[PDB]
Amino acid sequence: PWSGPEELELALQDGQRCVRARLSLTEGLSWGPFYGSIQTRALSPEREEPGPAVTLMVDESCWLRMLPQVLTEEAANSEIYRKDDALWCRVTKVVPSGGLLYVRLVTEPHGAPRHPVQEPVEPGGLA
């Protein structure tokens, strides 16, 4: 079927793969870390990179890529974010059983300024 949790269900309706809430996904519920990655957009898609530039790199059977991707909150009933190199999924909106849910990919402008190789002048104090 897919590689997904028991809280979720991949239903084949007319041959269509429908990602429906099996259980009622309560806001606040989360799953454990998954291995993969998500290349966040550090660019503006209205300018450059509005396509496959932003993708989640997870196992092809993994349920995370089986859900329709959204940047919005209303459609997203669950979001995937990375925390300490690993992906975590949290339920942001309470999904009724049978209801479909969309996946919100983390797109935090981290800034990506590399790691400060130039040490703070006179460390210890100030902060």
mmCIF file of N, CA and C in Angstrom:
data_model
loop_
_atom_site.group_PDB
_atom_site.id
_atom_site.type_symbol
_atom_site.label_atom_id
_atom_site.label_comp_id
_atom_site.label_asym_id
_atom_site.label_seq_id
_atom_site.Cartn_x
_atom_site.Cartn_y
_atom_site.Cartn_z
ATOM 1 N N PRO A 1 0.832 -1.193 0.000
ATOM 2 C CA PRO A 1 0.000 0.000 0.000
ATOM 3 C C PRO A 1 0.868 1.245 0.000
ATOM 4 N N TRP A 2 1.559 1.471 1.106
ATOM 5 C CA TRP A 2 2.455 2.579 1.275
ATOM 6 C C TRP A 2 3.214 2.326 2.556
ATOM 7 N N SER A 3 4.197 3.106 2.839
ATOM 8 C CA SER A 3 4.861 3.020 4.098
ATOM 9 C C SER A 3 4.359 4.164 4.968
ATOM 10 N N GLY A 4 3.299 3.893 5.706
ATOM 11 C CA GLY A 4 2.676 4.905 6.497
ATOM 12 C C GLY A 4 2.231 4.394 7.843
ATOM 13 N N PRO A 5 1.744 5.279 8.708
ATOM 14 C CA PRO A 5 1.352 4.935 10.060
ATOM 15 C C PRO A 5 -0.078 4.401 10.133
ATOM 16 N N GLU A 6 -0.425 3.810 11.260
ATOM 17 C CA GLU A 6 -1.745 3.212 11.459
ATOM 18 C C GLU A 6 -2.818 4.264 11.692
ATOM 19 N N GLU A 7 -2.390 5.488 11.894
ATOM 20 C CA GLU A 7 -3.286 6.604 12.159
ATOM 21 C C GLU A 7 -3.822 7.149 10.840
ATOM 22 N N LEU A 8 -3.104 6.845 9.796
ATOM 23 C CA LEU A 8 -3.392 7.281 8.452
ATOM 24 C C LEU A 8 -3.793 6.082 7.625
ATOM 25 N N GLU A 9 -4.421 6.301 6.489
ATOM 26 C CA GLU A 9 -4.800 5.203 5.631
ATOM 27 C C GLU A 9 -4.779 5.609 4.168
ATOM 28 N N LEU A 10 -4.169 4.771 3.363
ATOM 29 C CA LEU A 10 -4.117 4.960 1.940
ATOM 30 C C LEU A 10 -5.261 4.142 1.374
ATOM 31 N N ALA A 11 -6.232 4.798 0.836
ATOM 32 C CA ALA A 11 -7.395 4.130 0.344
ATOM 33 C C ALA A 11 -7.399 4.174 -1.147
ATOM 34 N N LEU A 12 -7.704 3.070 -1.755
ATOM 35 C CA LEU A 12 -7.785 3.013 -3.178
ATOM 36 C C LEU A 12 -9.215 3.051 -3.588
ATOM 37 N N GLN A 13 -9.623 4.194 -4.012
ATOM 38 C CA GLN A 13 -10.979 4.423 -4.396
ATOM 39 C C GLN A 13 -11.037 4.730 -5.869
ATOM 40 N N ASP A 14 -11.491 3.742 -6.637
ATOM 41 C CA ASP A 14 -11.618 3.795 -8.115
ATOM 42 C C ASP A 14 -10.227 3.704 -8.778
ATOM 43 N N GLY A 15 -9.253 3.316 -7.978
ATOM 44 C CA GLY A 15 -7.886 3.208 -8.444
ATOM 45 C C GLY A 15 -7.064 4.392 -8.012
ATOM 46 N N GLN A 16 -7.735 5.352 -7.433
ATOM 47 C CA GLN A 16 -7.112 6.562 -6.982
ATOM 48 C C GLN A 16 -6.555 6.336 -5.601
ATOM 49 N N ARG A 17 -5.374 6.836 -5.374
ATOM 50 C CA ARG A 17 -4.759 6.757 -4.085
ATOM 51 C C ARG A 17 -5.170 7.967 -3.257
ATOM 52 N N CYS A 18 -5.981 7.727 -2.275
ATOM 53 C CA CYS A 18 -6.490 8.776 -1.435
ATOM 54 C C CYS A 18 -5.880 8.662 -0.048
ATOM 55 N N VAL A 19 -5.212 9.711 0.381
ATOM 56 C CA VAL A 19 -4.619 9.749 1.704
ATOM 57 C C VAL A 19 -5.619 10.301 2.717
ATOM 58 N N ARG A 20 -6.279 9.414 3.402
ATOM 59 C CA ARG A 20 -7.314 9.824 4.305
ATOM 60 C C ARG A 20 -6.929 9.539 5.734
ATOM 61 N N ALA A 21 -7.483 10.313 6.624
ATOM 62 C CA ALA A 21 -7.310 10.109 8.027
ATOM 63 C C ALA A 21 -8.051 8.853 8.418
ATOM 64 N N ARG A 22 -7.344 7.919 8.976
ATOM 65 C CA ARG A 22 -7.926 6.668 9.381
ATOM 66 C C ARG A 22 -8.514 6.904 10.746
ATOM 67 N N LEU A 23 -7.692 7.459 11.594
ATOM 68 C CA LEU A 23 -8.061 7.866 12.899
ATOM 69 C C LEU A 23 -8.361 9.357 12.808
ATOM 70 N N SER A 24 -8.838 9.936 13.854
ATOM 71 C CA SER A 24 -9.003 11.355 13.881
ATOM 72 C C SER A 24 -7.702 11.956 14.407
ATOM 73 N N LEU A 25 -6.965 12.593 13.524
ATOM 74 C CA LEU A 25 -5.680 13.176 13.870
ATOM 75 C C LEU A 25 -5.882 14.432 14.662
ATOM 76 N N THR A 26 -5.548 14.369 15.906
ATOM 77 C CA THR A 26 -5.703 15.463 16.802
ATOM 78 C C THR A 26 -4.542 16.442 16.716
ATOM 79 N N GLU A 27 -4.875 17.715 16.671
ATOM 80 C CA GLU A 27 -3.895 18.780 16.682
ATOM 81 C C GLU A 27 -2.990 18.650 17.915
ATOM 82 N N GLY A 28 -1.711 18.568 17.693
ATOM 83 C CA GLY A 28 -0.784 18.422 18.789
ATOM 84 C C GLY A 28 -0.107 17.070 18.774
ATOM 85 N N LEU A 29 -0.761 16.091 18.156
ATOM 86 C CA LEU A 29 -0.209 14.762 18.033
ATOM 87 C C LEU A 29 0.941 14.812 17.051
ATOM 88 N N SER A 30 1.930 14.023 17.264
ATOM 89 C CA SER A 30 3.058 13.997 16.389
ATOM 90 C C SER A 30 3.596 12.584 16.272
ATOM 91 N N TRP A 31 4.413 12.377 15.285
ATOM 92 C CA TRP A 31 5.084 11.126 15.080
ATOM 93 C C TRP A 31 6.555 11.314 15.363
ATOM 94 N N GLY A 32 7.274 10.220 15.426
ATOM 95 C CA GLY A 32 8.682 10.272 15.681
ATOM 96 C C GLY A 32 9.462 10.689 14.456
ATOM 97 N N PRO A 33 10.773 10.852 14.581
ATOM 98 C CA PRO A 33 11.621 11.317 13.485
ATOM 99 C C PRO A 33 11.718 10.313 12.330
ATOM 100 N N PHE A 34 11.790 10.832 11.141
ATOM 101 C CA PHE A 34 11.933 10.051 9.939
ATOM 102 C C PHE A 34 13.240 10.447 9.295
ATOM 103 N N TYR A 35 13.814 9.571 8.528
ATOM 104 C CA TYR A 35 15.026 9.886 7.857
ATOM 105 C C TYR A 35 14.808 10.253 6.428
ATOM 106 N N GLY A 36 15.348 11.372 6.096
ATOM 107 C CA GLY A 36 15.235 11.947 4.820
ATOM 108 C C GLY A 36 15.655 13.362 4.960
ATOM 109 N N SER A 37 15.247 14.212 4.080
ATOM 110 C CA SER A 37 15.598 15.599 4.187
ATOM 111 C C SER A 37 14.598 16.418 3.400
ATOM 112 N N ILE A 38 14.621 17.704 3.587
ATOM 113 C CA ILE A 38 13.766 18.619 2.864
ATOM 114 C C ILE A 38 14.604 19.811 2.502
ATOM 115 N N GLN A 39 14.769 20.060 1.236
ATOM 116 C CA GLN A 39 15.527 21.207 0.836
ATOM 117 C C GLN A 39 14.642 22.438 0.765
ATOM 118 N N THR A 40 14.723 23.219 1.822
ATOM 119 C CA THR A 40 13.949 24.420 1.990
ATOM 120 C C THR A 40 14.288 25.451 0.909
ATOM 121 N N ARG A 41 13.365 26.324 0.610
ATOM 122 C CA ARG A 41 13.624 27.299 -0.401
ATOM 123 C C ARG A 41 14.222 28.550 0.200
ATOM 124 N N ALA A 42 15.448 28.819 -0.165
ATOM 125 C CA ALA A 42 16.148 30.009 0.295
ATOM 126 C C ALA A 42 16.089 31.065 -0.784
ATOM 127 N N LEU A 43 15.248 30.800 -1.734
ATOM 128 C CA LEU A 43 15.045 31.655 -2.864
ATOM 129 C C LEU A 43 13.594 31.999 -2.946
ATOM 130 N N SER A 44 13.297 32.924 -3.782
ATOM 131 C CA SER A 44 11.947 33.332 -4.024
ATOM 132 C C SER A 44 11.467 32.686 -5.325
ATOM 133 N N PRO A 45 10.479 31.756 -5.255
ATOM 134 C CA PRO A 45 9.972 31.001 -6.434
ATOM 135 C C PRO A 45 9.311 31.893 -7.489
ATOM 136 N N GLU A 46 8.992 33.114 -7.111
ATOM 137 C CA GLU A 46 8.413 34.056 -8.046
ATOM 138 C C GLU A 46 9.528 34.612 -8.956
ATOM 139 N N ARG A 47 10.744 34.340 -8.563
ATOM 140 C CA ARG A 47 11.910 34.724 -9.299
ATOM 141 C C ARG A 47 12.589 33.491 -9.877
ATOM 142 N N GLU A 48 13.263 32.747 -9.021
ATOM 143 C CA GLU A 48 13.962 31.553 -9.423
ATOM 144 C C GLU A 48 13.504 30.384 -8.582
ATOM 145 N N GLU A 49 13.497 29.231 -9.205
ATOM 146 C CA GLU A 49 13.219 27.938 -8.585
ATOM 147 C C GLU A 49 11.791 27.785 -8.018
ATOM 148 N N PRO A 50 10.778 27.674 -8.897
ATOM 149 C CA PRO A 50 9.403 27.453 -8.490
ATOM 150 C C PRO A 50 8.937 26.004 -8.723
ATOM 151 N N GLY A 51 9.854 25.140 -9.071
ATOM 152 C CA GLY A 51 9.490 23.784 -9.397
ATOM 153 C C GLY A 51 10.057 22.743 -8.437
ATOM 154 N N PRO A 52 10.777 21.714 -8.959
ATOM 155 C CA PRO A 52 11.319 20.592 -8.152
ATOM 156 C C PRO A 52 12.522 20.978 -7.292
ATOM 157 N N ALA A 53 12.834 22.249 -7.297
ATOM 158 C CA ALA A 53 13.917 22.803 -6.505
ATOM 159 C C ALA A 53 13.644 22.599 -5.035
ATOM 160 N N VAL A 54 12.381 22.626 -4.692
ATOM 161 C CA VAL A 54 11.961 22.367 -3.357
ATOM 162 C C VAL A 54 11.272 21.033 -3.381
ATOM 163 N N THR A 55 11.827 20.090 -2.685
ATOM 164 C CA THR A 55 11.305 18.753 -2.628
ATOM 165 C C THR A 55 11.685 18.118 -1.314
ATOM 166 N N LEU A 56 10.908 17.163 -0.894
ATOM 167 C CA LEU A 56 11.252 16.387 0.239
ATOM 168 C C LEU A 56 11.896 15.095 -0.219
ATOM 169 N N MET A 57 13.000 14.795 0.357
ATOM 170 C CA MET A 57 13.771 13.651 -0.014
ATOM 171 C C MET A 57 13.531 12.563 0.986
ATOM 172 N N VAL A 58 12.517 11.788 0.747
ATOM 173 C CA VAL A 58 12.172 10.682 1.609
ATOM 174 C C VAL A 58 11.989 9.456 0.753
ATOM 175 N N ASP A 59 11.952 8.292 1.387
ATOM 176 C CA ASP A 59 11.747 7.022 0.690
ATOM 177 C C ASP A 59 10.515 7.103 -0.171
ATOM 178 N N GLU A 60 10.579 6.530 -1.350
ATOM 179 C CA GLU A 60 9.499 6.648 -2.305
ATOM 180 C C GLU A 60 8.196 5.977 -1.856
ATOM 181 N N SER A 61 8.263 5.141 -0.838
ATOM 182 C CA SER A 61 7.075 4.480 -0.336
ATOM 183 C C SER A 61 6.514 5.265 0.865
ATOM 184 N N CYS A 62 7.325 6.179 1.401
ATOM 185 C CA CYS A 62 6.987 6.914 2.608
ATOM 186 C C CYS A 62 5.775 7.810 2.404
ATOM 187 N N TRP A 63 4.873 7.740 3.356
ATOM 188 C CA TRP A 63 3.614 8.460 3.341
ATOM 189 C C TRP A 63 3.778 9.984 3.252
ATOM 190 N N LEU A 64 4.911 10.498 3.703
ATOM 191 C CA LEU A 64 5.163 11.946 3.725
ATOM 192 C C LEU A 64 5.077 12.552 2.314
ATOM 193 N N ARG A 65 5.454 11.775 1.315
ATOM 194 C CA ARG A 65 5.420 12.252 -0.066
ATOM 195 C C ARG A 65 4.142 11.811 -0.772
ATOM 196 N N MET A 66 3.290 11.126 -0.048
ATOM 197 C CA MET A 66 2.051 10.608 -0.607
ATOM 198 C C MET A 66 0.927 11.619 -0.412
ATOM 199 N N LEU A 67 1.124 12.521 0.529
ATOM 200 C CA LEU A 67 0.167 13.582 0.791
ATOM 201 C C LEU A 67 0.427 14.760 -0.142
ATOM 202 N N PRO A 68 -0.629 15.490 -0.559
ATOM 203 C CA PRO A 68 -0.475 16.675 -1.402
ATOM 204 C C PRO A 68 0.241 17.780 -0.635
ATOM 205 N N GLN A 69 1.192 18.401 -1.267
ATOM 206 C CA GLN A 69 2.025 19.373 -0.608
ATOM 207 C C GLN A 69 1.421 20.748 -0.664
ATOM 208 N N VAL A 70 1.475 21.423 0.450
ATOM 209 C CA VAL A 70 0.955 22.758 0.575
ATOM 210 C C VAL A 70 1.924 23.652 1.340
ATOM 211 N N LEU A 71 1.824 24.921 1.069
ATOM 212 C CA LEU A 71 2.606 25.944 1.722
ATOM 213 C C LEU A 71 1.709 26.678 2.723
ATOM 214 N N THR A 72 0.428 26.410 2.629
ATOM 215 C CA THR A 72 -0.548 27.050 3.450
ATOM 216 C C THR A 72 -0.877 26.220 4.681
ATOM 217 N N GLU A 73 -1.583 26.826 5.587
ATOM 218 C CA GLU A 73 -1.930 26.244 6.858
ATOM 219 C C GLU A 73 -3.316 25.602 6.813
ATOM 220 N N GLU A 74 -4.217 26.184 6.049
ATOM 221 C CA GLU A 74 -5.581 25.701 5.981
ATOM 222 C C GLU A 74 -5.713 24.349 5.351
ATOM 223 N N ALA A 75 -4.948 24.110 4.335
ATOM 224 C CA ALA A 75 -4.990 22.840 3.671
ATOM 225 C C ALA A 75 -4.148 21.828 4.435
ATOM 226 N N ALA A 76 -3.120 22.312 5.087
ATOM 227 C CA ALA A 76 -2.221 21.457 5.800
ATOM 228 C C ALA A 76 -2.779 21.071 7.114
ATOM 229 N N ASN A 77 -2.946 19.825 7.296
ATOM 230 C CA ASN A 77 -3.412 19.350 8.571
ATOM 231 C C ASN A 77 -2.265 18.735 9.346
ATOM 232 N N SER A 78 -1.125 18.633 8.688
ATOM 233 C CA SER A 78 0.089 18.127 9.278
ATOM 234 C C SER A 78 1.279 18.795 8.588
ATOM 235 N N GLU A 79 2.335 19.053 9.322
ATOM 236 C CA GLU A 79 3.516 19.675 8.751
ATOM 237 C C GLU A 79 4.748 18.826 9.031
ATOM 238 N N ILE A 80 5.689 18.850 8.108
ATOM 239 C CA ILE A 80 6.934 18.130 8.262
ATOM 240 C C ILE A 80 8.018 19.141 8.460
ATOM 241 N N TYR A 81 8.739 19.008 9.518
ATOM 242 C CA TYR A 81 9.798 19.915 9.826
ATOM 243 C C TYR A 81 11.014 19.129 10.227
ATOM 244 N N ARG A 82 12.172 19.697 10.078
ATOM 245 C CA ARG A 82 13.362 19.020 10.482
ATOM 246 C C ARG A 82 13.847 19.567 11.787
ATOM 247 N N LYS A 83 14.255 18.682 12.622
ATOM 248 C CA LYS A 83 14.739 18.989 13.923
ATOM 249 C C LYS A 83 15.907 18.087 14.167
ATOM 250 N N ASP A 84 17.067 18.680 14.251
ATOM 251 C CA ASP A 84 18.326 17.966 14.456
ATOM 252 C C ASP A 84 18.558 16.923 13.352
ATOM 253 N N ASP A 85 18.560 17.437 12.122
ATOM 254 C CA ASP A 85 18.888 16.694 10.877
ATOM 255 C C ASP A 85 17.773 15.712 10.423
ATOM 256 N N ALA A 86 16.833 15.417 11.305
ATOM 257 C CA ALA A 86 15.803 14.433 11.035
ATOM 258 C C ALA A 86 14.460 15.109 10.869
ATOM 259 N N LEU A 87 13.539 14.438 10.217
ATOM 260 C CA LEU A 87 12.231 15.002 9.937
ATOM 261 C C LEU A 87 11.238 14.562 10.976
ATOM 262 N N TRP A 88 10.443 15.466 11.415
ATOM 263 C CA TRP A 88 9.401 15.197 12.376
ATOM 264 C C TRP A 88 8.077 15.657 11.795
ATOM 265 N N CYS A 89 7.024 14.942 12.097
ATOM 266 C CA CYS A 89 5.709 15.280 11.612
ATOM 267 C C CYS A 89 4.802 15.581 12.783
ATOM 268 N N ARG A 90 4.106 16.687 12.712
ATOM 269 C CA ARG A 90 3.166 17.064 13.743
ATOM 270 C C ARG A 90 1.825 17.352 13.101
ATOM 271 N N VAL A 91 0.777 17.068 13.810
ATOM 272 C CA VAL A 91 -0.559 17.338 13.345
ATOM 273 C C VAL A 91 -0.931 18.732 13.799
ATOM 274 N N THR A 92 -1.213 19.588 12.866
ATOM 275 C CA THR A 92 -1.513 20.951 13.163
ATOM 276 C C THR A 92 -3.013 21.210 13.260
ATOM 277 N N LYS A 93 -3.802 20.452 12.537
ATOM 278 C CA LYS A 93 -5.248 20.625 12.546
ATOM 279 C C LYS A 93 -5.913 19.297 12.774
ATOM 280 N N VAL A 94 -7.008 19.297 13.510
ATOM 281 C CA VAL A 94 -7.695 18.065 13.831
ATOM 282 C C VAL A 94 -8.498 17.554 12.632
ATOM 283 N N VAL A 95 -8.071 16.433 12.113
ATOM 284 C CA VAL A 95 -8.655 15.857 10.921
ATOM 285 C C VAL A 95 -9.657 14.792 11.313
ATOM 286 N N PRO A 96 -10.895 14.893 10.839
ATOM 287 C CA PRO A 96 -11.892 13.859 11.069
ATOM 288 C C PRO A 96 -11.561 12.611 10.235
ATOM 289 N N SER A 97 -11.954 11.453 10.712
ATOM 290 C CA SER A 97 -11.692 10.224 10.015
ATOM 291 C C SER A 97 -12.399 10.222 8.660
ATOM 292 N N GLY A 98 -11.666 9.883 7.635
ATOM 293 C CA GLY A 98 -12.197 9.897 6.308
ATOM 294 C C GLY A 98 -11.796 11.146 5.567
ATOM 295 N N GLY A 99 -11.411 12.167 6.308
ATOM 296 C CA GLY A 99 -11.015 13.409 5.708
ATOM 297 C C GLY A 99 -9.630 13.317 5.128
ATOM 298 N N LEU A 100 -9.389 14.056 4.078
ATOM 299 C CA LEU A 100 -8.092 14.065 3.440
ATOM 300 C C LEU A 100 -7.244 15.142 4.077
ATOM 301 N N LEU A 101 -5.958 14.989 4.025
ATOM 302 C CA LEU A 101 -5.075 15.950 4.599
ATOM 303 C C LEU A 101 -3.921 16.244 3.673
ATOM 304 N N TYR A 102 -3.434 17.449 3.759
ATOM 305 C CA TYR A 102 -2.341 17.910 2.952
ATOM 306 C C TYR A 102 -1.133 18.077 3.861
ATOM 307 N N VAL A 103 0.048 18.011 3.293
ATOM 308 C CA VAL A 103 1.276 18.090 4.056
ATOM 309 C C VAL A 103 1.980 19.451 3.841
ATOM 310 N N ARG A 104 2.316 20.107 4.930
ATOM 311 C CA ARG A 104 2.991 21.396 4.889
ATOM 312 C C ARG A 104 4.488 21.136 5.022
ATOM 313 N N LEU A 105 5.235 21.463 4.011
ATOM 314 C CA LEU A 105 6.682 21.304 4.065
ATOM 315 C C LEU A 105 7.291 22.491 4.738
ATOM 316 N N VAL A 106 8.208 22.246 5.640
ATOM 317 C CA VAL A 106 8.912 23.299 6.328
ATOM 318 C C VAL A 106 9.705 24.165 5.344
ATOM 319 N N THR A 107 9.454 25.436 5.379
ATOM 320 C CA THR A 107 10.180 26.368 4.584
ATOM 321 C C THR A 107 10.579 27.544 5.444
ATOM 322 N N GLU A 108 11.485 27.289 6.347
ATOM 323 C CA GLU A 108 11.968 28.327 7.194
ATOM 324 C C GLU A 108 13.186 28.935 6.559
ATOM 325 N N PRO A 109 13.187 30.244 6.318
ATOM 326 C CA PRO A 109 14.374 30.932 5.868
ATOM 327 C C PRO A 109 15.397 30.923 7.003
ATOM 328 N N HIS A 110 16.253 29.919 6.987
ATOM 329 C CA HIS A 110 17.238 29.693 8.043
ATOM 330 C C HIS A 110 18.284 30.777 7.985
ATOM 331 N N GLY A 111 18.402 31.364 6.823
ATOM 332 C CA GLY A 111 19.361 32.389 6.581
ATOM 333 C C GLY A 111 20.533 31.807 5.871
ATOM 334 N N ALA A 112 20.970 30.662 6.383
ATOM 335 C CA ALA A 112 22.109 29.899 5.878
ATOM 336 C C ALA A 112 23.354 30.778 5.742
ATOM 337 N N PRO A 113 23.921 31.218 6.874
ATOM 338 C CA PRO A 113 25.066 32.094 6.886
ATOM 339 C C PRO A 113 26.356 31.339 7.171
ATOM 340 N N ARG A 114 26.307 30.004 7.015
ATOM 341 C CA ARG A 114 27.420 29.118 7.330
ATOM 342 C C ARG A 114 27.679 29.136 8.830
ATOM 343 N N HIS A 115 28.738 28.530 9.253
ATOM 344 C CA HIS A 115 29.068 28.547 10.649
ATOM 345 C C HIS A 115 30.122 29.607 10.861
ATOM 346 N N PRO A 116 29.969 30.462 11.891
ATOM 347 C CA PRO A 116 30.905 31.550 12.163
ATOM 348 C C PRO A 116 32.327 31.055 12.409
ATOM 349 N N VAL A 117 33.151 31.172 11.395
ATOM 350 C CA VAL A 117 34.536 30.797 11.494
ATOM 351 C C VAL A 117 35.302 31.937 12.149
ATOM 352 N N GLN A 118 34.801 33.137 11.962
ATOM 353 C CA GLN A 118 35.388 34.274 12.588
ATOM 354 C C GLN A 118 34.756 34.448 13.941
ATOM 355 N N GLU A 119 35.553 34.183 14.943
ATOM 356 C CA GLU A 119 35.161 34.208 16.337
ATOM 357 C C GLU A 119 34.690 35.604 16.771
ATOM 358 N N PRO A 120 33.766 35.688 17.742
ATOM 359 C CA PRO A 120 33.341 36.970 18.289
ATOM 360 C C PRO A 120 34.522 37.652 18.970
ATOM 361 N N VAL A 121 34.722 38.925 18.688
ATOM 362 C CA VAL A 121 35.835 39.645 19.262
ATOM 363 C C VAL A 121 35.660 39.797 20.775
ATOM 364 N N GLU A 122 36.565 39.163 21.490
ATOM 365 C CA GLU A 122 36.597 39.110 22.937
ATOM 366 C C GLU A 122 35.356 38.355 23.470
ATOM 367 N N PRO A 123 35.363 37.013 23.375
ATOM 368 C CA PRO A 123 34.260 36.183 23.829
ATOM 369 C C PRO A 123 34.204 36.085 25.354
ATOM 370 N N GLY A 124 33.225 35.376 25.835
ATOM 371 C CA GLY A 124 33.041 35.202 27.241
ATOM 372 C C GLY A 124 31.831 35.956 27.712
ATOM 373 N N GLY A 125 31.911 37.264 27.653
ATOM 374 C CA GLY A 125 30.824 38.083 28.111
ATOM 375 C C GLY A 125 29.971 38.612 26.985
ATOM 376 N N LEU A 126 29.285 39.724 27.267
ATOM 377 C CA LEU A 126 28.369 40.432 26.348
ATOM 378 C C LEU A 126 27.077 39.658 26.096
ATOM 379 N N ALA A 127 27.209 38.410 25.760
ATOM 380 C CA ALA A 127 26.105 37.557 25.458
ATOM 381 C C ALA A 127 26.515 36.129 25.738
#
